[PDB]
Amino acid sequence: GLYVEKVSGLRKDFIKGVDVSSIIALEESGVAFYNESGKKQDIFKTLKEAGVNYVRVRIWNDPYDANGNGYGGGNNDLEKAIQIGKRATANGMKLLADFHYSDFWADPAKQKAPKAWANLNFEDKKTALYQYTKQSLKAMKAAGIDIGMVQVGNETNGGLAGETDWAKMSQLFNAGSQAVRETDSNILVALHFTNPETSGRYAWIAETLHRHHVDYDVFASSYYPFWHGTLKNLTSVLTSVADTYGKKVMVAATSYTYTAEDGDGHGNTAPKNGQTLNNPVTVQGQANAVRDVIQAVSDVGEAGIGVFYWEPAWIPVGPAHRLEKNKALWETYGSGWATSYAAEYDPEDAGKWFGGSAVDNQALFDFKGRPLPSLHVFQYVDTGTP
Numbered sequence: 017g018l019y020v021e022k023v024s025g026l027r028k029d030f031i032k033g034v035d036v037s038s039i040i041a042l043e044e045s046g047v048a049f050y051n052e053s054g055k056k057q058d059i060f061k062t063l064k065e066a067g068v069n070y071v072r073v074r075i076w077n078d079p080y081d082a083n084g085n086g087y088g089g090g091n092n093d094l095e096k097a098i099q100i101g102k103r104a105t106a107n108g109m110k111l112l113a114d115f116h117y118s119d120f121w122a123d124p125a126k127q128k129a130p131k132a133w134a135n136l137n138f139e140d141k142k143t144a145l146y147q148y149t150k151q152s153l154k155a156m157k158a159a160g161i162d163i164g165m166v167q168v169g170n171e172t173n174g175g176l177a178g179e180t181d182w183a184k185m186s187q188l189f190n191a192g193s194q195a196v197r198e199t200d201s202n203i204l205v206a207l208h209f210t211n212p213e214t215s216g217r218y219a220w221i222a223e224t225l226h227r228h229h230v231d232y233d234v235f236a237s238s239y240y241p242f243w244h245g246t247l248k249n250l251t252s253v254l255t256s257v258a259d260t261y262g263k264k265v266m267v268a269a270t271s272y273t274y275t276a277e278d279g280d281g282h283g284n285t286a287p288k289n290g291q292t293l294n295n296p297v298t299v300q301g302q303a304n305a306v307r308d309v310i311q312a313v314s315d316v317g318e319a320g321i322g323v324f325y326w327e328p329a330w331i332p333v334g335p336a337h338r339l340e341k342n343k344a345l346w347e348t349y350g351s352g353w354a355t356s357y358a359a360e361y362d363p364e365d366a367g368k369w370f371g372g373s374a375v376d377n378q379a380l381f382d383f384k385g386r387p388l389p390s391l392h393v394f395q396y397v398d399t400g401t402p
């Protein structure tokens with residue numbers, strides 16, 4: 017069925033990554049994954065066979081209330097990062113450790129200090145950040161994990177760990193980078209931004225990072241085609257960073273919709289009125305979208321090192337008609353994007369929107385955990401379809 021056009025100029029060592037941070041909370045909710053032969057299999061094995069070479073995991077400092085009730089979103093702490101890391105390593109895939117330096121979702125709107133850092137002055141918060149990263153990386157190495165890359169922050173467009181001043185953010189970037197450098201010289205340090213479509217944003221950020229002497233290897237970007245402008249633009253803003261500053265570049269988070277259907281009863285992020293949808297909302301469309309983002313980063317040349325698909329397997333804990341039954345699983349295991357317990361930390365967003373998966377229709381597995389044809393995109397970019 018599926019067609020993929022060969023990506024031209026694609027380097028043989030290109031990073032083909034997935035962020036599957038929700039996997040632990042989902043397996044705990046009784047969710048199962050399959051190979052294309054239709055038998056139960058560890059998702060990491062199926063990912064490997066599909067030609068994935070890299071796993072990304074989000075790390076929240078303390079994603080739990082005082083009583084240890086998970087904030088949800090996969091309840092992603094260091095302990096789960098090690099679980100995920102061990103499995104990735106066991107399956108021949110390198111790890112990208114994605115430190116949010118927050119107790120919950122870090123994005124362009126939300127960059128809240130971890131609860132433990134809330135009353136620290138800047139010096140002490142900075143050494144806490146450095147100390148946390150170093151300790152976290154030591155634990156992962158101790159677990160035998162193959163770490164390829166560390167992301168110091170996540171979509172830090174406007175802040176980091178409670179800080180909004182770019183001179184302060186830069187010192188924080190350097191605190192984390194320092195920990196990585198001390199751990200292993202071979203680990204790539206990524207910084208991760210989003211909204212590449214914004215006029216002169218990435219030029220400004222890269223210049224600011226340079227002026228503040230931030231030590232990093234990779235300038236990473238999000239790319240969701242619904243809001244983030246053109247592939248031509250993406251290539252262009254990343255090429256400018258690569259050429260001007262001598263940085264590697266990559267896409268740290270990308271996805272597309274394979275269906276318009278909501279598989280679990282919790283409203284999905286996309287597709288929606290007003291979003292740019294250049295591809296059909298189908299398995300083929302989804303594969304086109306992934307192949308094209310890979311093309312756009314490859315087109316950067318030497319410096320374009322990879323693409324990570326964000327959450328290819330945040331599938332339903334159960335069908336949409338059993339919404340209220342699903343809610344119990346989301347609430348107990350944190351297998352939706354947020355639980356009600358996160359209202360303490362994030363009242364404005366998680367407080368009003370808490371629930372299930374907002375991205376089940378952007379998975380590369382169906383609602384029942386079988387791989388979609390579009391999962392083959394990681395192999396077929398090298399060769400094209402027959």
Ligand SMILES: OC[C@H]1O[C@@H](O[C@@H]2[C@H](O)[C@@H](O)[C@H](O[C@@H]3[C@H](O)[C@@H](O)[C@H](O)O[C@@H]3CO)O[C@@H]2CO)[C@H](O)[C@@H](O)[C@H]1O
Nearest residue numbers: 121122123282283284285353365369370371373374375
């Ligand atoms: O469910 C339909 C509604 O979804 C709302 O989106 C919610 C939050 O506003 C949104 O921030 C959250 O996104 C999560 C996280 O904050 C973000 O950084 C990451 O990329 O995605 C996470 C979810 O996968 O998602 C929830 C979804 O309930 C919309 O704001 C609203 O318009 C409506 O469609």
Ligand SMILES: [Ca+2]
Nearest residue numbers: 280282373374
């Ligand atoms: Ca949903």
